[PDB]
């Protein structure tokens, strides 16, 4: 974490603005507030039915940790209070010492306890994934006030986690049906999102979650994002070479000659080449035919990638048999069976001469993966014969209400008594049973031995770490 | 401003992959590399017929200049290279000295020129809103290597600041027929979306966004983002006290002594109270009345504000008339009336009682919003007896096709000769004429004086600055 970027946002005001309003609005003699973060619903995306937890480490670090000791705790704390009083002034016309802020500060860390589920362990929809409590009695306004950031930072990660999963899930089943092995699912989604993410802080995070079940990856800073906050024994990502429709284009209309040149400049890499500039299936029909010689005599570690890019997502891989020219009604995949060699395996598939792959990376949807995987699979072509490049209609094209997640106060403690409190509902402590029960009734006293939800932050402290080894171990083992 | 986030983004790789590969991949003899970024299509959201300019400034300062002088041009030359070679020869496994970064180091900026459009201009769709080039032979490789920086982090402000002009734009075009004047409308859409943002910075650049159409907001941080890339005479933006779930329900069963604990909190103060937390109807039809005096005593720039959360957004508001009670069947809006005073105003439409309010934040979309106000103009109430919380399904519910923003290569330049690039909408260099025209088949030997894109950064400089109360003016001046 060697860098550093200029920030604007306030430590102490960072949140939804109506926050600011309610610590005064609790009862008086109010001192705890308990609170669950909750994946409630995939109605919106059944295909989730499993959320991976992912993100909590790096959002403590950055945040809880380093934004708040850097940018707070670290600061004269007259100016720090200063701040915030002419703020509340300046928009409500209230004159609010901020003497809370003051003792936050005299603290000198965050009377805050944070359990979770250990990240790449898995959960059912509705099984709570975090819990947090202030652990001071003055503090109780803390609890409320953090919600905005934690689900502002945290429901991005998970939900892409959990996307990546289910990717995964379908493509190991592809493979046990269609492959002898699945030494290419690793590599079958690829994540080609970061250009339509809505930041940087976001495409860090979903493409961390990518990488939890995917070593293919564009997205080079959440490589280093989980190089920062995780760490790792083993490869992180990996990404080949491939060509853009503007290096395409800058050689002109003769890509029989492009693609040689291209080939040239990596003859010892694996080199995906866009294929649809100017004509694609005069590029399949012609061009890889007359190419064929020079593509068979690279070593298989350096295969030439064919990618397209425009068409009928089904059509351009899997055929259209309404289509009026045979390579048309055959698609990429049966062109490339036809042009280069290919065995056929014990399942009784087709799997393409190695020297020659596809990736497509247009628009990838799970919908869409799917059925191109179906088509092939009719078609008697292995599920290993193409790559998905996942893009931003996969990891951007999603909102905090895909899994439902919401943050929610369960219990208060008022006086010294804990009260559940509830809109009408988790009502109570939680602890999370097994991976898909928990039981809410719960008082502070109760047991909680082996409760999935794990002590992770408390008091300033980050209490358990994982690295990303762990957390791709434990979403094997899920 | 004063505050500081750790980083992890390496500088000379803040891009996709595959572009670390593109550089040698160009002709021999590149020189120039000219690209335009334009949204392209409105089809997924054809109510936004005008893209608002929005972005350019803080994303200039923020990262060509601060995050690259901060990372790279400050550091040790040999460090910055080293580990990018490093990063290459692990990932992806090939060998790349990074001489081409060591050149970039030392020349100690980004040779690029940027022109874009004055941010709080608007234009039609297909008009391109910024052009980008480098400016040393050199550096050809450099333009399109920062495609993914650049749209990463700019199409979701000016999706943001778009969204909220059609926003005003509707919520104007009621004012007109059914209240005596627009003086409500700057608060009638308040940003709900912190929550429901992908991150803290795509909130702060989408709340960003939100503040130039409207003053409402409860993304404090977009706030203070304004306040540091933009700044503003005045005061950036507005927002009221307003309880959540965990207050009322901490307080028990009892909300007519809640609510009236919550106004003597706030007894100068305009107040928001969601009503929803144990028995809407209730609260409405039994406690309302109850504490009508206490309401109407209060000063009316201290309105009380009722705010439903669940319900169908349509029938809560303006009334079901598939029933079983009088109150559902009239809704919120019409049973506040019933219940408080209220006046005809001179358009003929009623106006609610100024000691009431109502905010309706559950889920607010663009068509929700122009329903809603549909329905209580087809039962004569005035535009203005409703505020908009406008949340995560406004803001965050967004793609780059949602306005089809692209980053394209248009024109190169090869050994001296320059030749538009004709990938199978824009050809050539640029230049945008008026709000809904662009001409272009141009070079750079041609007249670009009447131009609507106006130079902006070059090597390294910020050329022209802005701050908030222009880009608010422009916006008023575009309506328009
Ligand atoms: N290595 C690559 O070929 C690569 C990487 C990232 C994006 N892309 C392309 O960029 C386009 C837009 O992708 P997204 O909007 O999903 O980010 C797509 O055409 C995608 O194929 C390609
Ligand atoms: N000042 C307020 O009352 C306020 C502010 C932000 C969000 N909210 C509520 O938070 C919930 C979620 O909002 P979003 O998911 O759209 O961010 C909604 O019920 C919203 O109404 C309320």
Redesign the pocket.
């Known amino acids: 974490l060697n860098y550093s970027s200029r920030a604007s946002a306030i430590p102490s005001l960072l949140c939804?603005?109506?926050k600011t309003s309610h610590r005064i609005m609790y009862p008086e003699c109010s001192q705890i507030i308990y609170s669950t973060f909750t994946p409630r619903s995939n109605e919106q995306a059944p295909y989730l039915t499993q959320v991976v937890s992912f993100g909590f480490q790096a959002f403590i670090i950055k945040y809880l940790i380093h934004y708040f000791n850097d940018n707070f705790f670290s600061r004269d704390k007259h100016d720090v209070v200063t701040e915030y009083s002419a703020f509340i002034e300046k928009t409500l016309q209230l004159e609010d010492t901020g003497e809370h802020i003051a003792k936050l500060h005299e603290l000198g860390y965050l009377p805050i306890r944070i359990k979770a589920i250990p990240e790449g362990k898995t959960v059912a929809i509705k099984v709570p994934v975090m819990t947090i409590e202030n652990t001071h009695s003055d503090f109780f306004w803390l609890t409320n006030y953090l919600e905005?950031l934690i689900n502002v930072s945290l429901w991005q990660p998970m939900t892409s986690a959990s996307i990546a999963f289910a990717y995964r899930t379908a493509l190991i089943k592809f493979a046990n049906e269609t492959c002898d092995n699945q030494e290419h699912v690793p590599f079958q989604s690829h994540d080609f999102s970061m250009r339509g993410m809505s930041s940087l802080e976001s495409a860090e995070t979903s493409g961390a979650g990518h990488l939890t079940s995917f070593l293919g990856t564009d997205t080079i800073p959440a490589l280093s994002f989980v190089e920062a906050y995780y760490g790792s024994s083993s490869l992180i990502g990996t990404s080949i070479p491939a060509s853009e429709h503007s290096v395409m284009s800058s050689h002109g209309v003769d890509e029989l000659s492009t693609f040689r040149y291209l080939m040239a400049k990596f003859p010892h890499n694996m080199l995906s080449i866009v294929s649809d500039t100017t004509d694609f299936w005069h590029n399949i029909t012609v061009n890889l035919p007359l190419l064929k010689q020079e593509i068979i005599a690279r070593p298989e570690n350096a295969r030439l990638v064919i990618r397209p890019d425009s068409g009928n997502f089904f059509a351009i891989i899997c055929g259209d048999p309404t289509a009026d020219t045979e390579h048309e009604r055959k698609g990429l995949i049966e062109c490339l069976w036809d042009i280069f060699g290919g065995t056929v395996n014990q399942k009784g598939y087709k799997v393409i001469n190695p020297h020659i792959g596809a990736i497509y990376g247009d628009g990838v949807t799970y919908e869409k993966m799917f059925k191109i995987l179906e088509g092939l699979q009719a078609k008697g072509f292995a599920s290993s014969n193409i790559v998905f490049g996942v893009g931003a209609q996969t990891y951007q094209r999603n909102?905090?209400?895909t899994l439902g997640f919401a943050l929610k106060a369960t219990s208060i403690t008022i006086n010294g008594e804990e009260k559940a409190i509830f809109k009408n509902s988790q009502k109570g402590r939680v602890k999370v049973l097994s991976r898909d029960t928990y039981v809410d009734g719960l008082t502070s006293a109760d047991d909680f031995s082996d409760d999935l939800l794990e002590l992770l932050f408390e008091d300033g402290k980050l209490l358990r770490q994982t690295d990303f080894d762990e957390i791709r171990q434990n979403l094997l083992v899920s």
């Open positions: 939804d603005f109506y905005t909102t905090r209400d």
